[PDB]
Amino acid sequence: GSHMQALSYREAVLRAVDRLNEQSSEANLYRLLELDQPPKADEDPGTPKPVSFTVKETVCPRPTRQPPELCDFKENGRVKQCVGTVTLDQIKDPLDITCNEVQGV
């Protein structure tokens, strides 16, 4: 009801965005600069949710022991639009997202 159970679409994107920072072997982390509102979002538990967002370079190296949102943000950092599909009513989420840069950066 109030706590427990994740079902807000952003919860799945927050986990995927944090996983992208951990799975990537880059020098600086990439916090989500902006999230998009794709089709089929928070209205289908059995089916995965096609997410889409733009990520920018932050001021923290890969090994930070925390998510990119916990750190600041580099305005002169490049941004990339990483998009993938993930379920909102289940765990075990593999890495199936593709990035195609962000128009306007």
Side-chain angles (χ1 to χ4, degrees):
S2 276
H3 289 286
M4 218 175 78
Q5 211 220 293
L7 193 86
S8 296
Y9 167 69
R10 207 150 243 226
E11 256 124 71
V13 188
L14 193 138
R15 279 212 184 229
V17 161
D18 170 65
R19 284 287 163 114
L20 200 71
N21 268 243
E22 195 94 81
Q23 74 176 86
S24 200
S25 195
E26 275 199 280
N28 288 264
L29 286 168
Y30 268 80
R31 185 247 186 257
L32 188 137
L33 190 73
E34 235 180 71
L35 176 70
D36 201 84
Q37 211 199 103
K40 305 296 284 174
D42 209 67
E43 47 97 73
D44 224 316
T47 309
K49 234 70 82 251
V51 176
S52 270
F53 46 77
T54 42
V55 299
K56 191 152 190 185
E57 216 177 305
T58 32
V59 298
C60 278
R62 237 227 123 271
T64 355
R65 307 149 209 146
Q66 43 109 89
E69 187 117 33
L70 219 84
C71 273
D72 212 79
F73 226 173
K74 305 224 291 259
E75 211 290 295
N76 282 270
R78 65 227 251 243
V79 181
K80 239 85 149 164
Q81 191 135 59
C82 284
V83 304
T85 67
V86 287
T87 175
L88 185 69
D89 242 281
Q90 178 178 264
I91 328 106
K92 199 131 96 282
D93 40 276
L95 289 321
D96 289 89
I97 65 103
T98 308
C99 307
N100 64 283
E101 300 217 275
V102 178
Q103 281 134 93
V105 65

